[PDB]
Short mmCIF file of C-alpha atoms in Angstrom, two decimals:
data_model
loop_
_atom_site.label_atom_id
_atom_site.label_comp_id
_atom_site.label_asym_id
_atom_site.label_seq_id
_atom_site.Cartn_x
_atom_site.Cartn_y
_atom_site.Cartn_z
CA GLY A 1 -17.60 -4.94 0.73
CA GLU A 2 -20.68 -7.15 0.56
CA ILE A 3 -21.28 -10.86 -0.03
CA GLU A 4 -23.76 -10.95 -2.91
CA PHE A 5 -24.36 -14.64 -3.61
CA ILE A 6 -23.57 -17.93 -1.87
CA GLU A 7 -24.13 -21.48 -3.09
CA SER A 8 -22.98 -25.00 -2.29
CA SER A 9 -19.79 -25.59 -4.29
CA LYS A 10 -21.02 -28.99 -5.53
CA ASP A 11 -23.90 -27.28 -7.35
CA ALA A 12 -21.34 -25.53 -9.59
CA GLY A 13 -18.96 -28.49 -9.97
CA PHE A 14 -16.33 -27.19 -7.53
CA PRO A 15 -14.87 -29.78 -5.14
CA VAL A 16 -14.75 -29.04 -1.44
CA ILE A 17 -11.54 -27.24 -0.52
CA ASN A 18 -10.00 -29.27 2.32
CA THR A 19 -8.18 -26.65 4.35
CA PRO A 20 -6.59 -27.17 7.82
CA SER A 21 -8.77 -28.03 10.83
CA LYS A 22 -6.20 -27.87 13.68
CA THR A 23 -3.83 -25.04 14.48
CA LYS A 24 -0.13 -25.55 13.82
CA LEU A 25 0.64 -23.35 16.85
CA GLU A 26 1.67 -25.34 19.93
CA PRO A 27 3.02 -24.18 23.30
CA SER A 28 6.76 -23.65 23.05
CA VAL A 29 9.39 -24.57 25.65
CA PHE A 30 9.12 -20.94 26.79
CA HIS A 31 5.34 -21.11 27.36
CA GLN A 32 5.64 -21.32 31.17
CA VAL A 33 8.65 -19.02 31.62
CA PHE A 34 6.84 -16.01 30.12
CA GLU A 35 3.37 -14.57 30.66
CA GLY A 36 0.76 -14.11 27.96
CA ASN A 37 -2.94 -14.10 27.13
CA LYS A 38 -3.13 -14.87 23.41
CA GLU A 39 -4.07 -18.26 21.97
CA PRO A 40 -4.45 -19.61 18.42
CA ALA A 41 -7.37 -18.16 16.51
CA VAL A 42 -10.47 -20.32 16.12
CA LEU A 43 -10.25 -22.32 12.89
CA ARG A 44 -13.44 -24.41 13.01
CA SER A 45 -17.08 -24.09 14.06
CA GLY A 46 -16.99 -26.55 16.95
CA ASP A 47 -14.09 -24.99 18.85
CA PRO A 48 -14.99 -25.24 22.57
CA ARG A 49 -13.63 -21.75 23.31
CA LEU A 50 -16.25 -20.09 21.10
CA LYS A 51 -18.80 -17.78 22.71
CA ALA A 52 -20.31 -16.82 19.35
CA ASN A 53 -21.15 -18.34 15.98
CA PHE A 54 -17.91 -18.88 14.05
CA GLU A 55 -19.07 -18.60 10.44
CA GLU A 56 -21.11 -15.46 11.09
CA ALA A 57 -18.13 -13.93 12.89
CA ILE A 58 -15.50 -14.54 10.21
CA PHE A 59 -17.67 -13.06 7.47
CA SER A 60 -19.05 -10.16 9.55
CA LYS A 61 -16.39 -7.70 8.34
CA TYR A 62 -18.25 -7.50 5.00
CA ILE A 63 -20.35 -4.68 6.43
CA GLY A 64 -21.80 -3.52 3.12
CA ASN A 65 -21.10 -0.91 0.50
CA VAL A 66 -21.88 2.76 0.15
CA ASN A 67 -23.10 3.24 -3.38
CA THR A 68 -21.94 6.67 -4.54
CA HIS A 69 -19.88 7.85 -7.48
CA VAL A 70 -16.46 9.46 -7.33
CA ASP A 71 -17.17 12.91 -5.89
CA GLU A 72 -15.31 16.23 -5.99
CA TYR A 73 -13.25 15.54 -2.87
CA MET A 74 -12.07 12.14 -4.14
CA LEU A 75 -11.17 13.68 -7.50
CA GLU A 76 -8.91 16.27 -5.89
CA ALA A 77 -7.41 13.66 -3.54
CA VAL A 78 -6.58 11.41 -6.51
CA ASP A 79 -5.03 14.38 -8.35
CA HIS A 80 -2.86 15.40 -5.40
CA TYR A 81 -1.65 11.89 -4.71
CA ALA A 82 -1.07 11.25 -8.44
CA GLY A 83 1.16 14.33 -8.57
CA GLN A 84 3.34 12.85 -5.82
CA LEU A 85 3.61 9.44 -7.47
CA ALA A 86 4.43 11.11 -10.80
CA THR A 87 7.81 12.21 -9.42
CA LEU A 88 8.82 8.54 -9.05
CA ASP A 89 8.64 7.74 -12.79
CA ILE A 90 6.86 4.43 -12.26
CA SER A 91 7.12 2.24 -15.33
CA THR A 92 3.82 0.84 -16.59
CA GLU A 93 5.67 -1.59 -18.84
CA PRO A 94 5.06 -5.25 -17.94
CA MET A 95 7.75 -6.75 -15.76
CA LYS A 96 9.55 -9.59 -17.50
CA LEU A 97 8.29 -13.00 -16.45
CA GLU A 98 11.52 -14.29 -14.91
CA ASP A 99 11.82 -11.14 -12.75
CA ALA A 100 8.14 -11.21 -11.70
CA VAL A 101 8.38 -14.88 -10.65
CA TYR A 102 11.90 -15.50 -9.36
CA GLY A 103 13.01 -12.19 -7.92
CA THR A 104 14.59 -8.86 -8.82
CA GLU A 105 15.72 -5.82 -6.88
CA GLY A 106 12.69 -4.40 -5.08
CA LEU A 107 10.50 -7.49 -5.60
CA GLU A 108 11.19 -10.71 -3.71
CA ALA A 109 10.58 -13.95 -5.58
CA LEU A 110 7.05 -15.32 -5.59
CA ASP A 111 6.56 -17.12 -2.26
CA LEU A 112 6.82 -20.87 -2.88
CA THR A 113 5.38 -21.87 0.52
CA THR A 114 1.93 -20.27 0.21
CA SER A 115 -1.13 -21.72 -1.51
CA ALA A 116 -1.12 -22.09 -5.30
CA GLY A 117 -4.87 -21.46 -5.22
CA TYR A 118 -7.41 -22.85 -7.67
CA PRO A 119 -7.45 -25.31 -9.39
CA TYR A 120 -4.06 -26.51 -8.18
CA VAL A 121 -5.22 -26.98 -4.57
CA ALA A 122 -7.88 -29.45 -5.76
CA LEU A 123 -5.38 -31.32 -7.97
CA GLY A 124 -2.57 -31.85 -5.43
CA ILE A 125 -0.34 -29.48 -7.42
CA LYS A 126 1.83 -27.27 -5.22
CA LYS A 127 3.81 -24.20 -6.22
CA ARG A 128 7.01 -26.28 -6.02
CA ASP A 129 5.58 -28.72 -8.60
CA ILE A 130 5.43 -25.85 -11.10
CA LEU A 131 8.25 -23.49 -10.09
CA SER A 132 11.90 -24.10 -9.33
CA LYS A 133 14.21 -21.69 -7.55
CA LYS A 134 17.26 -23.73 -8.59
CA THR A 135 16.47 -23.73 -12.33
CA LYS A 136 14.21 -20.65 -12.68
CA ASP A 137 12.13 -22.77 -15.04
CA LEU A 138 9.16 -21.03 -16.66
CA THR A 139 8.02 -23.76 -19.05
CA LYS A 140 5.62 -25.61 -16.73
CA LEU A 141 4.22 -22.28 -15.51
CA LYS A 142 3.60 -21.24 -19.11
CA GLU A 143 1.79 -24.57 -19.64
CA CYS A 144 -0.33 -24.10 -16.51
CA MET A 145 -1.21 -20.50 -17.34
CA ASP A 146 -2.20 -21.45 -20.90
CA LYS A 147 -4.19 -24.45 -19.69
CA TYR A 148 -6.23 -22.83 -16.93
CA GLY A 149 -6.24 -19.14 -17.85
CA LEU A 150 -6.89 -16.11 -15.67
CA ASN A 151 -9.68 -14.71 -13.48
CA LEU A 152 -9.93 -17.91 -11.44
CA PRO A 153 -11.75 -18.10 -8.09
CA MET A 154 -9.84 -17.19 -4.96
CA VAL A 155 -9.55 -19.71 -2.13
CA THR A 156 -10.49 -18.34 1.30
CA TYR A 157 -8.43 -19.53 4.28
CA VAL A 158 -8.75 -18.72 7.97
CA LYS A 159 -5.48 -17.21 9.22
CA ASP A 160 -3.67 -19.45 11.74
CA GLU A 161 -2.25 -16.93 14.22
CA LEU A 162 -2.35 -15.87 17.86
CA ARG A 163 -5.34 -13.74 18.93
CA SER A 164 -6.55 -12.04 22.09
CA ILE A 165 -8.96 -13.70 24.54
CA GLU A 166 -11.79 -11.55 23.18
CA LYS A 167 -11.12 -12.35 19.52
CA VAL A 168 -10.91 -16.09 20.25
CA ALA A 169 -14.22 -16.09 22.15
CA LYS A 170 -15.98 -13.96 19.52
CA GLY A 171 -14.56 -16.16 16.74
CA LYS A 172 -13.24 -13.08 14.94
CA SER A 173 -10.50 -14.95 13.09
CA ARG A 174 -9.02 -13.24 10.03
CA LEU A 175 -9.57 -14.41 6.45
CA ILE A 176 -6.81 -14.55 3.84
CA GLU A 177 -7.39 -15.07 0.13
CA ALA A 178 -5.16 -17.14 -2.13
CA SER A 179 -5.17 -15.98 -5.72
CA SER A 180 -4.56 -18.66 -8.31
CA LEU A 181 -0.86 -18.87 -9.13
CA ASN A 182 -1.94 -17.85 -12.64
CA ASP A 183 -3.50 -14.59 -11.45
CA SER A 184 -0.67 -13.87 -9.00
CA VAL A 185 1.85 -14.11 -11.83
CA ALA A 186 -0.22 -11.99 -14.23
CA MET A 187 -0.68 -9.28 -11.59
CA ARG A 188 3.05 -9.29 -10.83
CA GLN A 189 3.76 -8.87 -14.54
CA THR A 190 1.26 -6.00 -14.83
CA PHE A 191 2.19 -4.13 -11.64
CA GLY A 192 5.63 -5.48 -10.75
CA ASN A 193 7.45 -2.24 -11.55
CA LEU A 194 5.01 -0.33 -9.35
CA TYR A 195 5.59 -2.89 -6.57
CA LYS A 196 9.34 -2.44 -6.99
CA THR A 197 9.15 1.36 -6.85
CA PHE A 198 7.04 1.28 -3.68
CA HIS A 199 9.30 -1.25 -1.95
CA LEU A 200 12.37 0.82 -2.84
CA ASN A 201 10.84 4.17 -1.75
CA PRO A 202 9.01 3.90 1.58
CA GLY A 203 8.21 7.37 2.87
CA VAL A 204 6.01 10.38 2.26
CA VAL A 205 6.19 10.42 -1.55
CA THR A 206 4.76 6.93 -1.99
CA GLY A 207 2.85 7.47 1.25
CA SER A 208 3.81 3.84 1.89
CA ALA A 209 5.87 1.84 4.37
CA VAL A 210 5.33 -1.54 2.70
CA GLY A 211 8.65 -3.33 2.64
CA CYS A 212 10.36 -0.94 5.06
CA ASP A 213 13.04 -1.98 7.55
CA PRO A 214 11.95 -0.45 10.90
CA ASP A 215 15.50 -0.50 12.31
CA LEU A 216 16.45 2.05 9.62
CA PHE A 217 13.16 3.65 8.55
CA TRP A 218 12.22 4.78 12.03
CA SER A 219 14.82 7.50 12.27
CA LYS A 220 13.51 8.98 9.02
CA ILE A 221 9.85 9.09 10.04
CA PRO A 222 9.97 12.11 12.41
CA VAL A 223 12.04 14.01 9.85
CA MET A 224 9.29 13.43 7.25
CA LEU A 225 6.37 13.97 9.65
CA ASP A 226 7.43 17.18 11.35
CA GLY A 227 4.01 18.64 12.24
CA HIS A 228 1.11 17.81 14.53
CA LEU A 229 0.66 14.04 14.30
CA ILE A 230 -2.54 12.41 13.03
CA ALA A 231 -3.31 8.75 13.78
CA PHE A 232 -6.45 6.65 14.20
CA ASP A 233 -7.63 3.03 13.92
CA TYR A 234 -9.81 1.37 11.31
CA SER A 235 -12.14 -1.52 12.15
CA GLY A 236 -12.09 -4.06 9.32
CA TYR A 237 -10.56 -1.69 6.75
CA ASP A 238 -10.12 -4.22 3.94
CA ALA A 239 -13.63 -5.66 3.95
CA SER A 240 -15.23 -2.25 4.55
CA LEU A 241 -13.91 -0.76 1.30
CA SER A 242 -16.70 0.12 -1.12
CA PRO A 243 -16.35 -0.10 -4.92
CA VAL A 244 -16.07 3.69 -5.15
CA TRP A 245 -12.60 3.47 -3.57
CA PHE A 246 -11.52 0.94 -6.19
CA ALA A 247 -12.81 3.36 -8.85
CA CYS A 248 -10.54 5.99 -7.29
CA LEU A 249 -7.62 3.57 -7.43
CA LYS A 250 -8.31 2.87 -11.10
CA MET A 251 -8.36 6.61 -11.79
CA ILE A 252 -4.99 7.00 -10.04
CA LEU A 253 -3.40 4.14 -11.99
CA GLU A 254 -4.63 5.56 -15.30
CA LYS A 255 -3.12 8.93 -14.40
CA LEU A 256 0.15 7.02 -13.94
CA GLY A 257 -0.10 5.75 -17.52
CA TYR A 258 -1.69 2.34 -17.08
CA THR A 259 -4.19 1.61 -19.83
CA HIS A 260 -7.83 0.95 -19.00
CA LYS A 261 -7.14 -2.67 -19.93
CA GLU A 262 -4.23 -2.84 -17.48
CA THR A 263 -6.47 -1.64 -14.64
CA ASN A 264 -8.86 -4.56 -15.25
CA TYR A 265 -7.13 -6.55 -12.52
CA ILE A 266 -8.46 -3.99 -10.04
CA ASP A 267 -11.93 -5.25 -11.00
CA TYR A 268 -10.66 -8.78 -10.26
CA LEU A 269 -9.86 -7.59 -6.72
CA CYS A 270 -13.05 -5.58 -6.16
CA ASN A 271 -15.65 -7.93 -7.67
CA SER A 272 -14.41 -11.27 -6.56
CA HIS A 273 -15.29 -14.93 -6.64
CA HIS A 274 -14.29 -17.22 -3.78
CA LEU A 275 -14.23 -20.82 -2.58
CA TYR A 276 -14.48 -21.44 1.17
CA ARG A 277 -14.61 -25.11 2.19
CA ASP A 278 -17.85 -26.46 0.67
CA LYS A 279 -19.18 -23.05 -0.42
CA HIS A 280 -18.75 -20.81 -3.45
CA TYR A 281 -19.56 -17.10 -3.19
CA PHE A 282 -19.30 -13.67 -4.84
CA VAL A 283 -18.24 -10.41 -3.18
CA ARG A 284 -18.68 -6.83 -4.37
CA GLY A 285 -16.17 -4.45 -2.83
CA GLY A 286 -13.61 -5.22 -0.17
CA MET A 287 -9.86 -5.75 -0.67
CA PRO A 288 -9.23 -9.54 -0.81
CA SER A 289 -6.20 -9.45 1.47
CA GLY A 290 -3.60 -12.00 0.39
CA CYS A 291 -3.93 -11.58 -3.36
CA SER A 292 -1.02 -9.97 -5.21
CA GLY A 293 -0.34 -6.39 -4.18
CA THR A 294 -3.09 -5.97 -1.60
CA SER A 295 -0.82 -4.28 0.99
CA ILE A 296 0.37 -1.76 -1.59
CA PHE A 297 -3.12 -1.25 -3.05
CA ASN A 298 -4.61 -0.83 0.45
CA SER A 299 -1.89 1.75 1.16
CA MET A 300 -2.58 3.66 -2.06
CA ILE A 301 -6.32 3.71 -1.36
CA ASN A 302 -5.59 4.93 2.18
CA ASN A 303 -3.65 7.85 0.70
CA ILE A 304 -6.74 8.70 -1.37
CA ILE A 305 -9.10 8.23 1.60
CA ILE A 306 -7.37 10.47 4.15
CA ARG A 307 -6.93 13.26 1.62
CA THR A 308 -10.62 12.92 0.68
CA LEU A 309 -11.70 13.23 4.32
CA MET A 310 -9.42 16.20 4.99
CA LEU A 311 -10.71 18.01 1.89
CA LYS A 312 -14.33 17.33 2.84
CA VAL A 313 -14.11 18.53 6.46
CA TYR A 314 -11.42 21.23 6.10
CA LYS A 315 -12.26 23.21 3.02
CA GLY A 316 -9.17 25.35 2.76
CA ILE A 317 -6.78 22.58 3.77
CA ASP A 318 -3.43 22.75 1.95
CA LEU A 319 -2.58 19.16 1.01
CA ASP A 320 0.92 20.27 -0.03
CA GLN A 321 1.67 20.56 3.71
CA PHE A 322 -0.02 17.25 4.58
CA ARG A 323 2.23 14.19 4.94
CA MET A 324 1.29 10.58 5.53
CA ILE A 325 2.70 7.06 5.53
CA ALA A 326 0.42 4.03 5.35
CA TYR A 327 1.02 0.29 5.67
CA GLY A 328 -2.31 -1.04 4.48
CA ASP A 329 -4.84 0.30 7.00
CA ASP A 330 -2.17 1.50 9.47
CA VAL A 331 -1.49 5.25 9.07
CA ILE A 332 0.79 7.84 10.65
CA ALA A 333 0.45 11.38 9.34
CA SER A 334 1.00 15.03 10.14
CA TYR A 335 -0.22 18.52 9.33
CA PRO A 336 1.25 21.84 10.57
CA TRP A 337 -2.01 22.72 12.38
CA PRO A 338 -4.13 20.59 14.74
CA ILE A 339 -6.77 18.39 13.10
CA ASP A 340 -9.88 16.93 14.76
CA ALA A 341 -9.71 13.24 13.84
CA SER A 342 -13.25 12.73 15.19
CA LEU A 343 -14.52 14.91 12.35
CA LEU A 344 -12.55 12.82 9.85
CA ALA A 345 -14.06 9.67 11.34
CA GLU A 346 -17.62 10.94 10.84
CA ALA A 347 -16.77 11.83 7.25
CA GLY A 348 -15.33 8.32 6.92
CA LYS A 349 -18.56 6.76 8.17
CA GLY A 350 -20.42 8.46 5.32
CA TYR A 351 -18.08 6.62 2.96
CA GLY A 352 -18.54 3.24 4.67
CA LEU A 353 -15.35 3.32 6.75
CA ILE A 354 -15.16 2.66 10.50
CA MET A 355 -12.62 4.90 12.23
CA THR A 356 -11.92 5.07 15.97
CA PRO A 357 -9.22 6.59 18.22
CA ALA A 358 -5.69 5.31 17.78
CA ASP A 359 -4.65 2.12 19.58
CA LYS A 360 -8.13 1.26 20.90
CA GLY A 361 -8.21 4.44 22.97
CA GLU A 362 -11.54 5.51 24.40
CA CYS A 363 -11.24 9.21 23.53
CA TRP A 364 -9.86 11.15 20.57
CA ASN A 365 -6.76 12.17 22.51
CA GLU A 366 -3.71 14.03 21.29
CA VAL A 367 -1.31 11.84 19.37
CA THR A 368 2.27 12.52 20.46
CA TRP A 369 5.66 11.02 19.71
CA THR A 370 5.43 9.37 23.14
CA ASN A 371 2.13 7.54 22.54
CA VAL A 372 2.01 7.05 18.74
CA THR A 373 2.50 3.58 17.29
CA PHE A 374 3.09 2.36 13.76
CA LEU A 375 3.35 -1.33 12.82
CA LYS A 376 2.67 -1.92 16.55
CA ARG A 377 5.95 -0.15 17.43
CA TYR A 378 6.54 2.93 19.57
CA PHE A 379 9.12 5.62 18.73
CA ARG A 380 11.96 6.25 21.22
CA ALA A 381 14.91 8.48 20.38
CA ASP A 382 18.27 7.04 21.35
CA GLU A 383 19.61 8.52 24.59
CA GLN A 384 23.10 9.00 23.18
CA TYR A 385 22.44 9.67 19.47
CA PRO A 386 19.14 11.58 19.66
CA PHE A 387 18.75 11.76 15.86
CA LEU A 388 18.50 7.95 15.81
CA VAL A 389 15.08 6.54 16.72
CA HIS A 390 14.46 3.05 18.11
CA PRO A 391 11.41 1.14 16.87
CA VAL A 392 10.07 -0.28 20.14
CA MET A 393 7.95 -3.42 19.94
CA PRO A 394 6.34 -3.85 23.39
CA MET A 395 7.88 -6.66 25.43
CA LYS A 396 4.31 -7.91 26.04
CA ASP A 397 4.04 -8.72 22.33
CA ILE A 398 7.47 -10.34 22.26
CA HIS A 399 6.37 -12.44 25.26
CA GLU A 400 3.18 -13.48 23.45
CA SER A 401 5.14 -14.63 20.41
CA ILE A 402 7.84 -16.60 22.21
CA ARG A 403 5.30 -18.77 24.10
CA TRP A 404 4.12 -20.57 20.93
CA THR A 405 5.71 -22.18 17.90
CA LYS A 406 4.61 -23.63 14.58
CA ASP A 407 7.90 -25.52 14.25
CA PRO A 408 10.33 -26.07 17.15
CA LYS A 409 12.98 -27.01 14.59
CA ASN A 410 13.18 -23.26 13.87
CA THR A 411 13.64 -22.25 17.54
CA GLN A 412 17.02 -20.60 16.90
CA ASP A 413 15.74 -18.31 14.13
CA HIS A 414 12.51 -17.52 16.04
CA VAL A 415 14.31 -16.49 19.23
CA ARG A 416 17.00 -14.55 17.38
CA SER A 417 14.34 -12.58 15.47
CA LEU A 418 12.69 -11.73 18.79
CA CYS A 419 16.05 -10.62 20.20
CA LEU A 420 16.40 -8.17 17.30
CA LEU A 421 13.08 -6.64 18.41
CA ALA A 422 13.59 -6.83 22.17
CA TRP A 423 16.87 -4.98 22.65
CA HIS A 424 15.31 -1.68 21.54
CA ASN A 425 13.50 -1.82 24.90
CA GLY A 426 16.83 -1.11 26.60
CA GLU A 427 19.58 -3.09 28.27
CA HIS A 428 17.81 -3.96 31.53
CA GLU A 429 14.80 -5.36 29.66
CA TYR A 430 17.03 -7.28 27.23
CA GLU A 431 19.09 -8.80 30.07
CA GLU A 432 15.88 -9.96 31.74
CA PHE A 433 14.59 -11.41 28.45
CA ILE A 434 17.86 -13.29 27.89
CA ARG A 435 17.96 -14.55 31.48
CA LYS A 436 14.47 -16.03 31.23
CA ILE A 437 15.27 -17.61 27.85
CA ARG A 438 18.33 -19.18 29.47
CA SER A 439 16.26 -20.48 32.42
CA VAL A 440 15.13 -23.29 30.07
CA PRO A 441 17.84 -25.74 28.87
CA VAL A 442 17.03 -25.05 25.19
CA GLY A 443 17.83 -21.40 25.86
CA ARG A 444 21.43 -22.23 26.74
CA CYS A 445 21.79 -24.19 23.47
CA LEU A 446 20.98 -21.12 21.38
CA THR A 447 23.31 -18.52 19.90
CA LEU A 448 21.83 -15.29 21.27
CA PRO A 449 23.31 -11.91 20.32
CA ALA A 450 24.85 -9.73 23.00
CA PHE A 451 23.20 -6.38 23.73
CA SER A 452 26.40 -4.52 22.86
CA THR A 453 26.65 -6.37 19.55
CA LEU A 454 23.06 -5.49 18.66
CA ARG A 455 23.63 -1.83 19.52
CA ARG A 456 26.96 -1.63 17.69
CA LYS A 457 25.52 -3.20 14.53
CA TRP A 458 22.49 -0.88 14.65
CA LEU A 459 24.62 2.26 15.06
CA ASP A 460 26.90 1.08 12.25
CA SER A 461 23.97 0.45 9.89
CA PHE A 462 23.43 4.20 9.53
#
């Protein structure tokens, strides 16, 4: 992806978008009881923790585009992946408006707490002013979509989240795009059945884990990925994507039966128009993370990418024995024979992708079931039921999360969610976690699940 044109918003009649200046993250009551290093990401240029220029840093992931056409390796990758998706009988019929907006099996209702995008954000019109969970009203939405149309600018926000010491100092805060409510709804109508099918079928046919439940999905992963593991990191996957990869995605969707007209929204994602504060700018390439479907579309492109790289380096590869699962940029994969991921990474560089060893490792080491991670979680077979696999979020990450809060009124839900992650680290670690929680008076006011209850419910879920 590449920023192609920037101008002052006032020169085009756009008002300044007044987005937050302060973080909503504050130290929690557990901030002293636990250790951590992360702090809220930089949100503004004058932040005293900066050791770099903020605005250059947040837009630096737009590293440019490689300008090639769809080549022979991409074509075969698209064909192979299309054959897999064909077995799922994805409907290309539009999803009915009430289902696309207010919820159906496999597609949660449109999130009413996130930004309504342009022009609503400049008019004081929130999603709740248009939509109604209680009534499922569609009449105001119909009025708004008729009045303001489609293909509206995206609004760029800086993500308010905890980041490492290094990412705070370098100002490398993440950007999230808000599609206009109008475009979010239209994309959910166009692709909602695809979204539903992916959410309902995480695994090695979709090549997707979007919407998975790690407590359950984890025991399936080693059954599906029964060869030599392949894993690696991307640097700035979304913004690195060149238009050629969106062309590949359009080819895949048309093989699924979408019309050329129905794939036009992929052009809306690839060649995009944005408002950031007082600026208005155009981008060619890059996935605008936060628009409708970007996790699923990133995952589908990743399925095309890895197959392309394998075909290009290993002529004679048999993709019918390759298996992979992606969640956006995050990939875990396997092949019955060893594969040199450093060769893949060099092939990736030729396509404008930045690939490095898994989990910030220094060398291209062997990926094993002991050291592999997916969605930041390790894989640990249960001692007693060895066919059941614990997803293991490191306690370090649980400690980082519990030390901050965006709303202490939600303390009970926050801590309980962390308990559901922590107990997979074993009973001694969970006991210690609970004890430290309870060393603060708030902690003894909370309903915390017992280790044995967590284990019993997990075992019973299978």
